[PDB]
Enzyme design. Sequence first.
Site, mmCIF file in Angstrom:
data_model
loop_
_atom_site.group_PDB
_atom_site.id
_atom_site.type_symbol
_atom_site.label_atom_id
_atom_site.label_comp_id
_atom_site.label_asym_id
_atom_site.label_seq_id
_atom_site.Cartn_x
_atom_site.Cartn_y
_atom_site.Cartn_z
ATOM 1 N N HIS A 40 -7.287 -4.793 5.241
ATOM 2 C CA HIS A 40 -8.171 -5.361 4.384
ATOM 3 C C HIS A 40 -7.475 -6.756 3.766
ATOM 4 O O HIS A 40 -7.661 -7.233 2.760
ATOM 5 C CB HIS A 40 -8.589 -4.934 2.881
ATOM 6 C CG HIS A 40 -7.122 -4.166 1.900
ATOM 7 N ND1 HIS A 40 -6.129 -3.412 2.371
ATOM 8 C CD2 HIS A 40 -6.741 -4.686 0.961
ATOM 9 C CE1 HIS A 40 -5.839 -3.124 1.180
ATOM 10 N NE2 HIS A 40 -5.603 -4.196 0.351
ATOM 11 N N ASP A 84 -7.517 1.103 7.477
ATOM 12 C CA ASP A 84 -6.945 0.149 6.866
ATOM 13 C C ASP A 84 -5.951 -0.672 8.251
ATOM 14 O O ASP A 84 -4.420 0.195 7.394
ATOM 15 C CB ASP A 84 -6.819 -0.111 5.285
ATOM 16 C CG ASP A 84 -6.341 -1.053 4.762
ATOM 17 O OD1 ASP A 84 -7.001 -2.067 5.917
ATOM 18 O OD2 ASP A 84 -6.245 -1.186 3.593
ATOM 19 N N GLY A 175 -1.416 -7.131 -4.385
ATOM 20 C CA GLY A 175 0.150 -7.155 -3.901
ATOM 21 C C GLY A 175 1.337 -6.694 -2.928
ATOM 22 O O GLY A 175 1.542 -7.372 -2.133
ATOM 23 N N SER A 177 -0.040 -4.542 -0.475
ATOM 24 C CA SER A 177 -0.933 -3.815 0.602
ATOM 25 C C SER A 177 -0.856 -5.006 1.276
ATOM 26 O O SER A 177 -0.169 -5.758 1.369
ATOM 27 C CB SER A 177 -2.327 -4.025 0.376
ATOM 28 O OG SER A 177 -3.376 -3.805 -0.981
ATOM 29 N N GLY A 178 -0.295 -4.238 2.444
ATOM 30 C CA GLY A 178 -0.167 -4.087 3.522
ATOM 31 C C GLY A 178 0.922 -3.729 4.091
ATOM 32 O O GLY A 178 2.355 -3.754 5.344
HETATM 33 N N1 LIG Z 1 -1.433 2.380 -7.024
HETATM 34 C C1 LIG Z 1 -1.688 2.280 -5.355
HETATM 35 C C2 LIG Z 1 -2.290 0.448 -4.776
HETATM 36 C C3 LIG Z 1 -3.671 -0.084 -5.100
HETATM 37 C C4 LIG Z 1 -4.081 -1.533 -5.453
HETATM 38 C C5 LIG Z 1 -3.520 -1.369 -3.521
HETATM 39 C C6 LIG Z 1 -2.254 -1.238 -3.807
HETATM 40 C C7 LIG Z 1 -2.245 -0.018 -3.680
#
Ligand SMILES: [NH3+]Cc1ccccc1
Length: 223
Positions: A40, A84, A175, A177-178
């Site tokens: 994503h 993902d 932020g 993520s990944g």
């Molecule tokens: N609280 C878990 C999360 C939500 C949105 C993006 C990344 C992690």
Amino acid sequence: IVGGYTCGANTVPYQVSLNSGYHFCGGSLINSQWVVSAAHCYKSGIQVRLGEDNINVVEGNEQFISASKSIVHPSYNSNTLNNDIMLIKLKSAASLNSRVASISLPTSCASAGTQCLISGWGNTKSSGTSYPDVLKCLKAPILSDSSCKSAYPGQITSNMFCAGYLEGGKDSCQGDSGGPVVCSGKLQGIVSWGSGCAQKNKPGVYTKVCNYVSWIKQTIASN
Ligand SMILES: [NH3+]Cc1ccccc1
Ligand SMILES: [Ca+2]
């Protein structure tokens, strides 16, 4: 990261920042030429930034390397976030040392109750917004599959696990993520999704890397 601590400069040497003019996602260095992140996080025009602590100041250990190829998992579903995961090849090999280093892939899947390290430059607030400039860290356990499925009925596949705290207060966030979830010195998860950040009964959900090791190895061997 909500409720974490300042890691310290270059203490998480496999952490990368993906930059498209600005930081937008994390990732993990898995060898000198390949990064693993979340599907994503896909976009064109990625520069991978290694050796970062403060993402707004040049401190002297950075390596900035453009991506040559991105490979999103063949079965990624953007509606459910199943599968993902994405691989990014660097245009040139990074120079590895104590401050910029790869993280090993797992040979076995981690069990519920294992303590892991989650890191990133994402939002530090559960309500509102504050983005840090330096890398933040969080220690959190893997939750049982039953607790994860109870928190997110109908949404957890075999390629996901939950980690964190059902009481809330400590979690990954936008932020992050990944980025990596490392347990016992191996990459076990990728920061993927959740409902908000650090809310009661809504832990973070992570891509289960141990299910993808064969795909990762075969893809790197042929690209
Ligand atoms: N609280 C878990 C999360 C939500 C949105 C993006 C990344 C992690
Ligand atoms: Ca920097």
